[PDB]
């Protein structure tokens, strides 16, 4: 039952703050050691620092001038601070859980929240259909998300019942604004109620839509 | 007894977790398996599961850091049981103590620090204090023992380091002599406390020190020498307005002028301070007269409201006061002038010689007389030689002109000058009285009654002095004796009683009434003498 | 701090093959007080958080199946998969929890081999939706395919488009370890309606002669 | 009572020195200063430094590595002493025990281990035995609780392993169906002991086992026929030898051959073996006879000095040379008693000779006779004449030499032939 | 092993200037039975065995005068020579004596600087005693010279001798702080007897124009 | 008064065993650790190993597999020994004195011994004389050529001319050392006043004494 969840801002300018919230449940802060991870795009693992179960800290060694790690035993919260946010702080942020019977290795994982770092301004997304004539062969479809800032975007397919055969490629920057697309491969004898919706979600710019892939393929 | 130390634990540990503080054990394992626990705070009690025990082994053993500033000691008790649960020991009571760390740097209870001080101070001489606080462990260790020193001092210019601090009590004191607010008001300085007996980390305030004032400037007239020009009779006249300056604060009792006039001993001259230009307005207390003195210099001192500190030189002035000439009228010595002269004195003789003097010494003064006033034109003068004649013929007994027995003329005297002054005198003329009127009855017209007549006191004046006046002699003329008899009131004959003789008829009578004095005599006919138609009193 | 160094940075294995990593740590990790060397190995599967795989050097964490094996004494290390399966692919980071501040290692990223396979290409042209707004992007699908090796050259009216185009590729499938590919053509609506043909064309090394797909606007 | 535990310091520490182990504390230092020592083997007597203590905090260190296979426990005595020497405590126990470590590998008593196995033995028979050595602390730890292992086998041509050493004992048995000697004589062996039971520190050993030999194998004529001639009378002479092929091994009682002849009932034969070649040769024991048998036909069976753990019996024929041989006189010694009445033409006998040679004709001489007075006839050997005489012969019967030749062996026979007439 | 790292591998400075050397340890050294770090500091003087200059990181040992400085804490230490005499030139070398196996620093060089210094050149024939067993070696001194970068020339009738040439210069001097070099020509007993004038040149910083020094075989 | 000197061989052939005995004076060897340190030519100090007073031994973890270190304590001696040698072997070999009161570090240290690893042979060397009028001091030498192994001492009249003396390194061509040494002295000398220069190559068991006389 123990689980954490981190919450912040998704953008944050150059030279200004990053605070971060780490929400837990299922057990006690006092008595555990919450420690704080990230990872930059296609890097590795960055150990920042944790915070005790008595209220000790102990920081990076070359990021402990700008760090700040703080809790709340009565909210089940640990906080992160940074200063000074550079475009190398863009990362994902996690947290995690730990314990002296483990030697206080981190064995629960928070989801991660992305941090990104950058003056642009937020967009959002555009989502487009991409339809296709196939003759009893498994037919590919899919929608395309364009035109949105920052990261990132969730795509699911019919509400998460859509899984199997389905290709969510990762986004593209260019000129500030980014580009993902998916595929579903569905067989190509569909009922009426067998209908391709797929579910683009943007929380930065609080966007939420679905679009129907209806193919064109004559009468 | 052999008994457990303190099990001490360093803070701010950083791993591995857990690690061995201490294995206790308990000698009845001979006798069987024992397995041991241990309670308090800290193990059972919040904070719960910070101290743990092996219950097989005996090793206590530490979970997580420590810190020393939140809990600086844990009590715990540790227990032995055997295979059954019970007791085999009593209860060992366990101290663990968290070792302190310097891990708290100092700090100022304010970031900028205010101080006062004044000029000259002596050196040892308390400006202010500045304080600053440690967290870490005093009793054990010098992690907090802070050491004040001071780092910069702005500026410099009097010395480099004006002012010492002490490093175990944090006060600022004088260090050396020369301050002065003139040259420099207010000093910045930077002082740092640092732990392990100033070895260790540091921290940084500003202590701000201000100068005060003192009366360590004279002021200092800025023109040293004056000239001044005065008419002679004026009083508060503006001669000059004195110029000083003063290097102290502006508006404050060491900045305002405070004159005084040291050679004035007649108290003739006053000069006031200026409040809004601190200047000294030198006016004439009194009024000046030129031909007592012509010219003034006198010798203006300037000093403060307050004294002054330390010992300066008191700067003395110099004004030149000339006075100015102003034509004064002549004074009549003596202011009025008592001649006695008879009344019957002659008409081209002459009374007396007037004079009156100049004031103004420098000359070219011509004084003309002349008559002023003379309400009967009696009297003449000479323009040159101020002599009195006489015009016409003088009467003691005019009682217009000469209301007393005594004549008052006035006499002017007219100068020479750009403004002409007119002195004015008084003569008084006492006039002798001679024997030159006659007696004369006061009722000149009488009435009696027909029948019963009532006899009527006729009263004698003479407008003379006695002895020109003295008994008087009646006497009836032109007959009228046989109808009329008189006879003196009193032995003093100064009047007469007159009565009918005989019974007259009604109608009007005329008396010749004679009076005599001194051997002058006068008969006045119109003593118009009425008989009326009534018994007793004649009213007419 | 203490220094992790871990080695290969990247290794490719078949399904059914030993996979070996190791991780030196610049100072002993071993704690007198449990005889227990405090090392940790992570898995991160792609888009998914860090697992706790090993910890304690040879501990198992929950849920971690046995060919997963924690070796290693002193400062040597080493994580064994004794037999790789496709699920296995990830990047795995060695981290010492010995003292803070906690130090991770460079990782070691483990990719699948297997047998080579053609792409299945699928081209789609640009939606309604999108014309009306101005503009017109063409997408070319390129899904399951071995090896990640791959070129497209987007065809015109006979010639060569290259300004324009925006590739992306997948993560290495867990399932059956091929590779997918997403080829974007951006262009103007004006542009878009200027030509009439257009094609992407997939060069691989299953094949000498190009997987080629094509529309022409003028058809349905 | 609560007390204080024994006191546990690993061997081979690296420092820094010194380390503190634990701290004691007299409970009357409140009333004054209290100073500690210590005393025991360790402190103040030898191993003399190993162990300290600080005068006025009570903290017991030690300053320098230890080794628990030199000095594997210490037995220390602290003291608590005032500022004028009185001891304020009875002297408190203290032990420090040396926790071990893996840090002596195994050892084998020798390089080399020797053994032998016998020929085609069961499984499961003990062939040899080799023992290692560990000095760690057997007790409390398994750094010495070795495990043996076989390695190599050389070679390993009938099997892999057919050998199998035991992980505790370390014997070495076999665990085959078995080997012959004339395969693979020798067999070597690399065994290894291992600490940890077999994961910890290594050591290997050489085990060479020799198969011994037994008579698994018969001898085999090499040719299976022979023949040779000798002559008639004539003993030990060597009519022919004998070629045989044993597989075994050589200059052994299994290889050392034994001919026994089957067919010689009368013992007219033996066979010798020549131990340098191991062959038989085969010579005439007794003298033969031609006119007796003229071909024989002698079968040879060959063992071995040892019995066996199908003999080859050969075929040699024996020709029988024809010699000539002297008429044997039947009797060697005629004797026929006669008078001295005979007459001097008479015949007295007739010896007549036998003619051995069935292949001749015999003439009859007389060879010596002192009287001269004996005729003899040569075609029938009939003896004719041609006691007083004392001279001619002193014996009562005068003796007589008769020769036969044949057509040429001469031989002889003797005529004794047996009143007072003077 | 603890690796210790010192910075710089060489320095120079004139008498009276302080002098830094910095050295870095891979782990804590601090013993927490006596909380002393474990740090040592060994002077090496040219020709001579190391000496133990500082031990516990500030403690110095004996014989050693105050302007050694040794301070530092954690995983960062100093010896300092407050103001460095002209003796003290030497190598420096930080020690951890922590955990064995005990661990060197690189060690850190100290020069001393000075004013420049022409070089006394002297030259030298060869003696009788060797041209009797062969062979023939003149030897050229070049004393009492600052900077050490010097060159030398050997000409034979006046053209240049490359080969046979060997050259050593001593350590700087304790006292003056000079360099002081030695060449060799070394040739055989027939070529020396075939020329006649031999000489060195030294080409030195202080002067454009090379010292020259020479002898002729046929006189003296 | 704590004394150490390290002995052993000058020259030693390659993948042969090394020896060297450190003998100690002035101090109990059972309560002592003694270091050996090695310096190669012209490289920095390197640890090799120690031997513990109670018998415990650390080495260096780079030569371990080579090093053999023991002692005796009844002849205060402590032994190094090193296997197949190699000719970056070639250095100074040093062995040291420390006590647990110092935390074990080196406070006295021996003078060191030369261990030359090479297949070359011993030679001894070749002393000659360097003689040279500007009326102030005359700069004299001797040179001493092609020699093996190192080292040797060059002294000048036995020791009692030191100052002004320039002793240089010796330099290896063909497997055959060379150095000089110069001394400069007074001009116009007193009959009793001569320049020597003693020369000793204790591996070959070479004492050369070479007066410097002027050239005719
Ligand atoms: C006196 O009075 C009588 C009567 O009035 C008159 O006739 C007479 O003249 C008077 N005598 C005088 C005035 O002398
Ligand atoms: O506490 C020291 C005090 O002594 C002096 C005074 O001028 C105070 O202003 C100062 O604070
Ligand atoms: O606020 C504290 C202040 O102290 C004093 C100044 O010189 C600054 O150092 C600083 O701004
Ligand atoms: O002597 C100088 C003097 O001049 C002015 C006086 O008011 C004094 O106050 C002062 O002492
Ligand atoms: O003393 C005040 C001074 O002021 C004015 C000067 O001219 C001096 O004559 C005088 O003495
Ligand atoms: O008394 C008044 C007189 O005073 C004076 C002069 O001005 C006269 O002219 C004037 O009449
Ligand atoms: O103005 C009249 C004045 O002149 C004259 C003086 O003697 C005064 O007595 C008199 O009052
Ligand atoms: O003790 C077991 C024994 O087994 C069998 C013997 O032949 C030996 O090989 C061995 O010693
Ligand atoms: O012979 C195989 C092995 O035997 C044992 C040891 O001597 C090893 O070094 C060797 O490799
Ligand atoms: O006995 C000869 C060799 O063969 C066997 C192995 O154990 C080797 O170690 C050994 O040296
Ligand atoms: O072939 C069998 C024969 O082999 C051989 C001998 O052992 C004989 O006794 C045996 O009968
Ligand atoms: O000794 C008798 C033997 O003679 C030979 C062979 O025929 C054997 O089979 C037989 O047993
Ligand atoms: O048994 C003895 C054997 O010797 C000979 C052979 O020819 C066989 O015929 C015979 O049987
Ligand atoms: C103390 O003073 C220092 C130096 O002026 C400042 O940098 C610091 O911020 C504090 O004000
Ligand atoms: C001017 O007058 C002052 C009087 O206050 C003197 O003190 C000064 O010396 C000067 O004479
Ligand atoms: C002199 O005085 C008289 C008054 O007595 C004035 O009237 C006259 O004008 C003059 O001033
Ligand atoms: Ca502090
Ligand atoms: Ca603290
Ligand atoms: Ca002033
Ligand atoms: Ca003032
Ligand atoms: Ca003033
Ligand atoms: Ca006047
Ligand atoms: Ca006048
Ligand atoms: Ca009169
Ligand atoms: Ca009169
Ligand atoms: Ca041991
Ligand atoms: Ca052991
Ligand atoms: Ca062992
Ligand atoms: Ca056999
Ligand atoms: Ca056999
Ligand atoms: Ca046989
Ligand atoms: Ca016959
Ligand atoms: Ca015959
Ligand atoms: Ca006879
Ligand atoms: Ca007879
Ligand atoms: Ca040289």
Known sequence: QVQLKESGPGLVAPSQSLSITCTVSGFSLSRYGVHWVRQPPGKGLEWLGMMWGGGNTDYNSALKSRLSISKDNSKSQVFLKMNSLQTDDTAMYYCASSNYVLGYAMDYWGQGTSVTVSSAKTTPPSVYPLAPAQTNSMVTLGCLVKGYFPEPVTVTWNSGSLSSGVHTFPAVLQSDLYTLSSSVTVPSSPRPSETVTCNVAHPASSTKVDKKIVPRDCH | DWVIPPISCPENEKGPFPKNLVQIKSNKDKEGKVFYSITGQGADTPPVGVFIIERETGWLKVTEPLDRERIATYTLFSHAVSSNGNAVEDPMEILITVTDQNDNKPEFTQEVFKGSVMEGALPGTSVMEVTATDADDDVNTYNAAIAYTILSQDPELPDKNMFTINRNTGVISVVTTGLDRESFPTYTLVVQAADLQGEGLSTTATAVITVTDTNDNPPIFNPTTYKGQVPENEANVVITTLKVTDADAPNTPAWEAVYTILNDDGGQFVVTTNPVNNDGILKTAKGLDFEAKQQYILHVAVTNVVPFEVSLTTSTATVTVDVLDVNEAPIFVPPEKRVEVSEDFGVGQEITSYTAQEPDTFMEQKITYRIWRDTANWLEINPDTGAISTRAELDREDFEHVKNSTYTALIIATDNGSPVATGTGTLLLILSDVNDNAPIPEPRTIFFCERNPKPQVINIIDADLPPNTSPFTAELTHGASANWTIQYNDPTQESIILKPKMALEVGDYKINLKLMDNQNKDQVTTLEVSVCDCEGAAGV | ?220
């Open chain 3, 1 to 220: 701090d203490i220094v992790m160094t871990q080695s290969p940075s990247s290794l490719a294995m078949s399904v059914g093959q030993k996979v070996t990593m190791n991780c030196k740590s610049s100072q002993s990790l071993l704690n007198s007080s449990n005889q227990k060397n405090y090392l940790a190995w992570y898995q991160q599967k792609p888009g998914q958080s860090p697992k706790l795989l090993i910890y304690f050097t040879s501990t198992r964490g929950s849920g971690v199946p046995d060919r997963f094996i924690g070796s290693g004494s002193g400062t040597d290390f080493t994580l064994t998969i004794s037999s790789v399966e496709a699920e296995d692919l990830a990047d795995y980071f060695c981290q010492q929890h010995y003292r803070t501040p906690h130090t991770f290692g460079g990782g070691t990223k483990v990719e699948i081999k297997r047998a080579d396979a053609a792409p299945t290409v699928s081209i789609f042209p640009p939606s309604s939706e999108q014309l009306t707004s101005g503009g017109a992007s063409v997408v070319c699908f390129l899904n399951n395919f071995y090896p990640k090796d791959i070129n497209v050259k987007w065809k015109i009216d006979g010639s060569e488009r290259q300004n324009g185009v925006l590739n992306s590729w997948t993560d290495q499938d867990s399932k059956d370890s091929t590779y997918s590919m997403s080829s974007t053509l951006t262009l103007t609506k004006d542009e878009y309606e200027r030509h009439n043909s257009y094609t992407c064309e997939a060069t691989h090394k299953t094949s000498t002669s190009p997987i080629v797909k094509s529309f022409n606007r003028n058809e349905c």
